[PDB]
C-alpha cells in the first residue's frame, strides 16, 4: 500500500475543524480520508469517548503517511490536551495549535512535498494581521 | 436603542466563519445577532450577491455598536477584498485577516470593554504555534 509523505488531522471543539477543511477545499480541491481528516469534540460528548476516536484518527493516518500534523484550535483545549498526552514522544506526529485557514491551505498544498515546518508556521502567524494597518 | 462598544462580523469562503463562531460559543457562551454575525461565500455564489449581503451585515452591526471588527479567512480572498473596498476609509470598521479561534474568542470576551487591538492581534499570532517545539 501507498505511504505518502504527510497526513493532516484537523481537530477542535465544535465545528471549527470541519468548517476549516470545507473552506480549505474551496482553494486546494477536495481531499480524501487517507490524507486528511477532521474531528470535532461536540457539546454533550465527554473526553473519554473523544480520546480514542482521536487516537484512532492519528494511527490510521500513519498507516498511509510517514508523518502526521495535528492542527488544534487552541492551547489548553481538549483536542490539544489529548494530542500532546497521547503522542508526546512520537516524532512522526507534530502538533500545531491556534491554526488558521492559511496554515491549513499551505499544509494541504505541500503534503506531497518536502517542507520546512518552522517556516510554514512562521508564515501562518504573519498571515493573521490587521489589514488597514499593514496596507497603510 | 442600545449602542454597544463593538460588533463582530466573521466572514469567509465556505463554512470556516460559522464553524468558528459555533466553536467560540462553546467557550464564551451563545452570542446574538446585534453583536456577532457570520457570512460565508458558498460554492456556486457570485461576488455580486455576496457583496451586498456583506455590506448589509456591517451596516446593521453599526446600528447597534460603535465599531465593528471584520474577521476574514485570508488575504486576497473575496470576503477580505470586499471588506477593504467597501469600508476602506470608515474608521469605525476594522479588518483583521487570517483569524484563528484565539482571536475570535478574545474579541467576543472583550466586546463590552475598552481594548488594545494591536495587543489582541499580536497575542493571536503568538497563539498559533508548534506545541512540542514551544513546550520543549
Amino acid at each position: 500500500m501507498a505511504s505518502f509523505n504527510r497526513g493532516i488531522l484537523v481537530a477542535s471543539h465544535g465545528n471549527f475543524a470541519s468548517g476549516a477543511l470545507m473552506t480549505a477545499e474551496m482553494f486546494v480541491g477536495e481531499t480524501t480520508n487517507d490524507r486528511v481528516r477532521t474531528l470535532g469534540l461536540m457539546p454533550g460528548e465527554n473526553i473519554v469517548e473523544f480520546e480514542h476516536y482521536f487516537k484512532n484518527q492519528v494511527d490510521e493516518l500513519l498507516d498511509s503517511n510517514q508523518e502526521v500534523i495535528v492542527l488544534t484550535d487552541l492551547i489548553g483545549g481538549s483536542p490539544n490536551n489529548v494530542a500532546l498526552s497521547r503522542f508526546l514522544n512520537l516524532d512522526s506526529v507534530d502538533i500545531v495549535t491556534g491554526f488558521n485557514i492559511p496554515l491549513l491551505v499551505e499544509l494541504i498544498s505541500s503534503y506531497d512535498s518536502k517542507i520546512n515546518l518552522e517556516e510554514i508556521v512562521h508564515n501562518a502567524q504573519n498571515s493573521l494581521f490587521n489589514v488597514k494597518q499593514q496596507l497603510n
Side-chain angles (χ1 to χ4, degrees), chain A residues 6 67 69 94 96 103 106-107 110-124:
Chain A
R6 196 164 312 112
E67 299 170 358
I69 304 172
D94 285 303
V96 182
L103 186 54
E106 172 53 34
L107 288 174
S110 65
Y111 67 14
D112 296 315
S113 168
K114 259 177 161 193
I115 64 165
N116 181 336
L117 186 55
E118 289 61 55
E119 199 172 295
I120 289 184
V121 170
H122 179 72
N123 291 343

Side-chain angles (χ1 to χ4, degrees), chain A residues 8-125:
Chain A
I8 301 168
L9 175 64
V10 192
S12 67
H13 294 85
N15 292 340
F16 189 59
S18 54
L21 183 54
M22 183 277 186
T23 294
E25 291 171 318
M26 288 178 64
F27 299 102
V28 304
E30 207 220 27
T31 56
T32 61
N33 218 30
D34 57 333
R35 308 301 306 276
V36 184
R37 289 185 199 191
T38 70
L39 190 60
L41 172 54
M42 304 304 287
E45 295 186 344
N46 63 72
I47 57 175
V48 167
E49 73 202 303
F50 168 79
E51 185 276 300
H52 52 67
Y53 287 151
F54 186 94
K55 177 188 190 304
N56 283 349
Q57 300 285 70
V58 174
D59 290 342
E60 286 163 37
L61 278 172
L62 290 160
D63 294 327
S64 292
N65 299 94
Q66 291 180 254
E67 299 170 358
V68 172
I69 304 172
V70 181
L71 301 183
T72 66
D73 49 351
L74 80 181
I75 197 75
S78 297
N80 203 254
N81 288 336
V82 168
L84 186 65
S85 266
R86 181 60 77 172
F87 300 103
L88 182 62
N89 295 135
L90 189 52
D91 290 345
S92 61
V93 174
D94 285 303
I95 308 167
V96 182
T97 192
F99 78 91
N100 57 7
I101 277 292
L103 186 54
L104 180 52
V105 169
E106 172 53 34
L107 288 174
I108 295 167
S109 304
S110 65
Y111 67 14
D112 296 315
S113 168
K114 259 177 161 193
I115 64 165
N116 181 336
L117 186 55
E118 289 61 55
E119 199 172 295
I120 289 184
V121 170
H122 179 72
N123 291 343
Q125 296 170 332

